[PDB]
Amino acid sequence: HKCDITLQEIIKDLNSLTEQKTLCTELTVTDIFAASKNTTEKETFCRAATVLRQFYSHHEKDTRCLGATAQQFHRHKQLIRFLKRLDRNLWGLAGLNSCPVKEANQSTLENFLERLKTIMREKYSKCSS
């Protein structure tokens, strides 16, 4: 389970998500990476999945995000679709709903997703030769 291809599915969507630099991607999420980091792999997954579910739930219809042009709206819909898919994959790896997130610091979503991408690529690296 630890080195499952879900890791690739997550990294793919993080690569898609981090091309985006929009008003929406500068809105914030609770920075799970501001912890002095006392957490199992499964608990980190649960934490990331929680904050991202909060984000897409709160911003799927946010007028700062929805866009004026066709391209902006398309990019918003893509952002939300990729966040939901990333989130489904993170939950599947968490095996866990019960991970209280208590950090104060807020990160932009862009910075949070880049950090998560680094973490996931590191896990991938530790799985492979």
Author numbering: 1 to 129
Give excerpts from the publication.
Signal transduction of IL-4 is mediated by a sequential binding process, initiated first by binding of IL-4 to its high-affinity single membrane spanning receptor chain IL-4Rα.
The increase in affinity is mainly attributable to the reduced dissociation rates (koff) of T13D and F82D. In the variant T13D, the aspartate residue resides in the middle of the first α-helix αA, and the side chain is oriented towards α-helix C. Both carboxylate oxygens of Asp13 are involved in a bi-dentate salt bridge to Arg85 on helix αc, thereby tightly fixing the side chain of Arg85. In contrast, the χ3 torsion angle differs by 115° between IL-4 (58°, gauche- conformation) and T13D (-57°, gauche+ conformation). In contrast to the hydrogen-bonding network of Arg85 in wild-type IL-4, Arg85 in the complex of T13D:IL-4Rα is probably also fixed to Asp13 (T13D) via a bi-dentate salt bridge. This internal hydrogen bonding would result in fixation of the Arg85 side chain prior to complex formation.
